[PDB]
Structure 1
Amino acid sequence: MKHSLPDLPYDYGALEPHINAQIMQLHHSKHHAAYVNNLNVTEEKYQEALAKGDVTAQIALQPALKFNGGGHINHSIFWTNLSPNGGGEPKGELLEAIKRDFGSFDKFKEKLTAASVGVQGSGWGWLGFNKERGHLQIAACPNQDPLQGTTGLIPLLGIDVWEHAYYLQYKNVRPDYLKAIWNVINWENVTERYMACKK
């Protein structure tokens, strides 16, 4: 079982004018493609190392596995979090959980925006689900470090704040990108990840 680059559920230009086709094409077809290939390359090296019990080689490979493995996980989620039919507000139990845990939908937007803009360097802003406490929680992750593997939280909604995610369009003004991305959020997908946690 090899990992593969998933096809995008929409055309590269489907999110215009909020995210233009050139960013989407570069972000998906160059960046994500590289993470999955290097993940596959890295897993073969680690697979060899684990069989020989070469702990030094296993440990030397951990950054490459985390970096490329996280990149694959994160972008694969990210594409599903966006939709040309998205935007607006969530409904039903997710909306009620957000009001419950954050006060209002607007306060949640403020807190996730603040977490994303506050990332020093490259990283991600997340809405996550805390299985232990049974409530929603906002977290930020550096580089391509994935949410669940490093915090235990189930990822619901991720915001890529790597400069390659917005720079061609918004240059250094990260707040403009965060403002625009709310217009294409696929709350149906966010809701489906959330409902899968509860039973």
Structure 2
Amino acid sequence: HAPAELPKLGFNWKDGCAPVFSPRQMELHYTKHHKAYVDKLNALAGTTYDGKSIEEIILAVANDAEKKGLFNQAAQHFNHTFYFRCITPNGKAMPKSLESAVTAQFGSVEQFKDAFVQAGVNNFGSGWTWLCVDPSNKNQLVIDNTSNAGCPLTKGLRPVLAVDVWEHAYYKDFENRRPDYLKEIWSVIDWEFVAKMHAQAIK
């Protein structure tokens, strides 16, 4: 929404997000990077976008050369809020309903994970790797790569899982090792949040 604010996380960022993220990695990501997106969004939006949800702001400003700055900050605020709800200490096991949807689409959970890591590894520069529901294709699950502030809402996709591949997301704990970050992140994924987003996306 607007005036936007840094959301409360499901866990204490001061303890990191064990076993994959250190307190420093979480501190920089949330209190520096996400907070800057929130502040800049509030500054570029002012009072103009009041009452609108962040999704509505994103859709109103997407592909508008005069409001690219606002698109970048609004989309990054949505993207980080989504990503920070996708992680939790020690993760949460995948509920049956989501495991079933992932298995039917990708052949297995391990085939999905391998396909998602490949997409993340090959997402050139700053970006995001997503698992979305495609309402224009029988609510099927699709892996989607976005560049910079790119947001799948602009494509009509319904996000269910977001993984940040901007270097700041992993540089403190993994340095140049984006493949290791992608392989290890599975240990902290809150699959109960993903299943909730999946269940809501299919109506």
TM-score higher than 0.5 here?
Answer: yes
For residue 86 of structure 1, give the secondary structure of its aligned residue in structure 2.
Answer: coil
Q: CA deviation at 1:44?
A: 2.8
Instruction: Indicate the residue corresponding to 2:54 in structure 1.
Output: none
Please list every run of 5 or more consecutive structure 1 residues that lacks an aligned counterpart in the other structure: 48-57
Q: Contact 1:42–1:61 (CA<8 Å) still a contact in 2?
A: no
Equivalents in 2 of 1:82, 1:119: separation in Å? 20
Output the TM-score relative to the length of structure 2: 0.86
Match 2:124 to one of 120, 123, 138 = 120
- What percentage of residue pairs aligned between the two structures are identical? 36
RMSD: 1.8
Q: CA distance change for structure 1 residues 191 and 163 in 2, over 3 Å: closer, same or farther?
A: same
In 1, are the aligned partners of 2:19 and 2:90 still within 8 Å (CA)? no
8 Å contact kept, 1:46–1:61: no
Gaps of 5+ in 2: 50-62
Residue of structure 2 aligned with 1:67, choices 67, 72, 82: 72
Q: 1:59 to 1:195 in 2, by over 3 A?
A: closer
Going from structure 1 to structure 2, the CA distance change for 1:22 and 1:14 (only over 3 Å counts) comes to closer
1:152 maps onto 2:153 in alignment: no
Aligned length: 187
3-state SS of paired residue (2:136): coil
Query: CA offsets, 1:154-191, max 9 Å, x none?
Result: 11001101110111111111111111111000000000
Contact 2:152 / 2:159 at 8 angstroms: preserved in 1?
A: yes
Q: TM-score, normalised by structure 1?
A: 0.88
Task: Report the secondary structure of 2:123's partner residue.
Answer: coil
Other-structure match for 1:172: 176
Superposition misfits of 4+ residues, deviation over 3 angstroms: 58-61
- Partner residue of 2:41? 39
Please give the alpha-carbon distance, in whole angstroms, between the structure 2 residues aligned to 1:171 and 1:87: 26
Q: Partners in 1 of 2:64 and 2:130 — Cα distance?
A: 28
Distance 1:59 1:128, change over 3 A: closer
**How do 1:73-92 and structure 2 match up within 5 A?**
73-86=78-91, 88=93, 90-92=94-96
- Is 1:143 the equivalent of 2:148? yes
> Which residue does 2:5 correspond to in 1?
4
Q: Which amino acid aligns with 2:125?
A: G
